[PDB]
Design a protein around this nucleic acid. Structure first.
Lengths: 134, 260, 223
RNA sequence: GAAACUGCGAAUGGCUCAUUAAAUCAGUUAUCGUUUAUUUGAUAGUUCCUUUACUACAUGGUAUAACUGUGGUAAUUCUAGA
RNA sequence: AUUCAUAAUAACUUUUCGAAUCGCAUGGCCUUGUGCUGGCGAUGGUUCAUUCAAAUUUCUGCCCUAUCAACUUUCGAUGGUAGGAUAGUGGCCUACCAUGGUUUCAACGGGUAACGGGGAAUAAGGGUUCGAUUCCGGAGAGGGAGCCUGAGAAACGGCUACC
């Protein structure tokens, strides 16, 4: 609210990935450590992508407040924003969701016992059902 | 011991890669070499060391699989493919056609070419002899062996090749008065163009080498590599121009070329 | 001793109980598959030529024919024996089995039938068994119906049917060895390769002979 | 596509210093004294001796897995006959 | 620097080798029919080079002790020849023949709280003492020994035997 002046340095287009690479300059007096998701709105007004079509990470503020530096990456489309982008950040900005995985005990405890069986696991399951308990 | 070691780690690397140590890890191991030794260049170092487009290793993995980046007309659709000497690199749309040459200090370049001249290599022929079914065979820098050459090129020349068929087009000789672009040693690649050579027979052989700076220095024969006659040059010559001008004046000219 | 009765004609199997503690003394001192007359057993069985096909015991040891010892023995078994199904790629290995002469060490005897009998076709040919997997090969069709081959296979493709998803899945083994191009279109290009390929370097020694005839005439004009 | 055969990996990594005084190891040579899985580059029209009952190449044979249904031992990545 | 690479002879081979495989597009031409062409991948195989390698391999350099002066040779020591065996030269093993090889410029034996090196700590010059360990290379997977698979294991998150 004090001439936040979101500026860029080192703008490079990478058209084989169809993207613009840049940094996020900000001078923000008496408003410190600005945001993440608010800035993806204002960064649209150089390419008019969307409200949510720009990837960005960084924003380490510098000693004293007032300024920060991030590293942002804007593509053309959301349909391009599923293809060459940080998937954890695709989880982050509301694009993707939680993806469930076994905690690494019960992945390696899932597949070890399944390694020491041989069939698909109903031949012997009939035999235990036939004998003990017989 | 027991089999080929496929893991090397950084701080064992061929330092002309210029990889730091705070990431400092298992290095990108090259694939099996197409051309020559581990003085080569993998792909996934080059895309995020000096060309500076790749960010994540999965993202540069998400480039070469879609037949995007092309080398020698081919694509070489696996990841850590090595790079020879004066290798052409055909790019995609926006047409940033590249070429590797080495600087005055052994490091590479940030070099870009046009599609003109981007259809031939220069290969260090080293083993030309005749094989079975009577054919004389020739070898190249990349080992792209080519059938039925022009007989009597010589040994240890360079040839202008096709890179769509085998078909060397124009050879060149190697005598007193050429232009030489050496690679290998502390002082690789200024130019020397000749001043003398000798016999030295059996141990090595030496080539006396002198640029326009007019100091002369001596280099063993396996490193020298001509790219033309006096005032020839075949290729798009880089911007450091191959001089290795000395330690003080480069600081003195950067004291001047920044325009204070 | 237990009566696992099986049947090599189309199929039947179930394991039965025992009494004949003295007629199992017909069974022994031959390994497997030779002969047991049904009349040598009690005459609940007749018209049955019992050949015997192994079994188990206390300790669960199976039977392998490299015996001639009426107890267990531990042995080096590598490839084609009953065990090692495979494992870590050699892996010789060592386990223990019994083979020959049958005693009351045993628990089960796998009796299997040569001759069909008259009386008890309720555990041999009660019902014809629905063997599950048919022919997968197109070669496994034309003499499977004896077609005297010209009858143009894909005639009798088994579609197996359950319309629980309303569309009944209509599936069938997808035979290999189906003789159409692109078997032949691939076959033709390999027939077309060394037409177009081998002549191309044959028309490279030809040009080699041309411009080097004059080149080896030039220094033959050395004077 | 659950398995399961078939193919490559499991010989690299990670750990430790016990043995080991021309031994390893550092530099330095050599392979005209040798073998190579792959990466790359090129490279086989002739295979028929019935070389004229080749007999099918407009395309052959068996030998089997998961699976079905039958088992033992108390157990083990234990295995059998059909 | 070659008996090299190569070519041809005169023959041999439990014959090694040269497709009985899959995905997209669906073509061209009329001799309209499995007439005939008919693209690109994904594999895989004979040789020859490149890399990854792996094996040996010559030159110099290895702390302390003569209260260790001779050490080796039928249980190979040192050579030659001939054969085997290796992936490959050679005492690497065998048959025969010869009597050698190292050594007060410190052999041999013994000690090492001795894995070697790049490297540390100390700091006028010259040093002294470390370096098991962020890298390179060697060895080992309780102790020895032998092993089938595999291009590559004397593998040990492979196996057999003895303690």
């Amino acid at each position: 609210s004090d001439a936040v002046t979101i500026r860029t340095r080192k703008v490079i287009s990478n058209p084989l990935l169809a993207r613009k690479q840049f940094v996020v300059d900000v001078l923000h007096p008496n408003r410190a450590n600005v945001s993440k998701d608010e800035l993806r709105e204002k960064l649209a007004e150089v390419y008019k992508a969307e409200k949510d079509a720009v990837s960005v990470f960084g924003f380490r503020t510098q000693f004293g407040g007032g300024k920060s530096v991030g590293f942002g990456l804007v593509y053309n489309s959301v349909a391009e924003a599923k293809k060459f982008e940080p998937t954890y950040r695709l989880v982050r900005y509301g694009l993707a969701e939680k993806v469930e995985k076994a905690s690494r005990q019960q992945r390696k405890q899932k597949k070890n016992r399944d390694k020491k069986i041989f069939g698909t696991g109903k031949r012997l399951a009939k035999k235990v059902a036939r004998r003990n308990a017989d | 011991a027991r089999g080929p070691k496929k893991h090397l780690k950084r701080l064992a690397a061929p330092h002309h890669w210029l990889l730091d140590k705070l990431s400092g890890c298992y290095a990108p191991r090259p694939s099996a070499g197409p051309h020559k030794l581990r003085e080569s260049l993998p792909l996934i170092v080059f895309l995020r060391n000096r060309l500076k487009y790749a960010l994540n290793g999965r993202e540069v993995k998400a480039i070469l699989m879609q037949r995007h980046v092309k080398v020698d007309g081919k694509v070489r659709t696996d990841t850590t493919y090595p790079a020879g000497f004066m290798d052409v690199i055909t790019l995609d749309a926006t047409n940033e056609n590249f070429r590797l040459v080495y600087d005055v200090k052994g490091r590479f370049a940030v070099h870009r070419i046009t599609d003109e001249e981007a259809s031939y290599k220069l290969g260090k022929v080293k083993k030309v002899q005749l094989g079975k079914k009577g054919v004389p065979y020739v070898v190249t820098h990349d080992g792209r062996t080519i059938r039925y050459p022009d007989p009597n090129i010589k040994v240890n020349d360079t040839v202008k090749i096709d890179l769509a068929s085998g078909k060397i087009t124009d050879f060149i000789k190697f005598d007193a008065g050429k232009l030489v672009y050496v690679t290998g040693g502390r002082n690789l690649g200024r130019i020397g163009t000749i001043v003398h050579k000798e016999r030295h027979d059996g141990g090595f052989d030496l080539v006396h080498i002198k640029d326009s700076l007019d100091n002369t220095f001596v280099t063993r024969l396996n490193n020298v590599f001509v790219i033309g006659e006096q005032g020839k040059p075949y290729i798009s010559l880089p911007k450091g121009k191959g001089i290795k001008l000395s330690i003080a004046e480069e600081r003195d000219r950067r004291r001047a070329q920044q325009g204070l | 001793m237990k009566l696992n009765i099986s049947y090599p004609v189309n199929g039947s199997q179930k394991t039965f109980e025992i009494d004949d503690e003295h007629r199992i003394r017909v069974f022994f001192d031959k390994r497997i598959g030779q002969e047991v007359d049904g009349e040598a057993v009690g005459d609940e069985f007749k018209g049955y030529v019992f050949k015997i096909s192994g079994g188990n015991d206390k300790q669960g040891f199976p039977m392998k024919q490299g015996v001639l010892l009426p107890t267990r023995i531990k042995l080096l078994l590598t490839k084609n024996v009953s065990c090692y199904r495979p494992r870590r790629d050699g892996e010789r290995k060592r386990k223990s089995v019994r083979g020959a002469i049958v005693g009351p060490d045993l628990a089960v005897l796998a009796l299997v039938i040569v001759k069909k009998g008259e009386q008890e076709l309720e555990g041999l040919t009660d019902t014809t068994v629905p063997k599950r997997l048919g022919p997968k090969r197109a070669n496994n069709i034309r003499k499977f119906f004896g077609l005297s081959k010209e009858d143009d296979v894909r005639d009798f493709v088994i579609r197996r049917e359950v319309t629980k998803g309303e569309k009944t899945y209509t599936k069938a083994p997808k035979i290999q060895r189906l003789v159409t191009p692109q078997r032949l279109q691939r076959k033709r290009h390999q027939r077309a390769l060394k037409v177009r390929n081998a002549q191309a370097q044959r028309e490279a020694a030809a040009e080699y002979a041309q411009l080097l005839a004059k080149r080896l005439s030039e220094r033959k004009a050395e004077k």
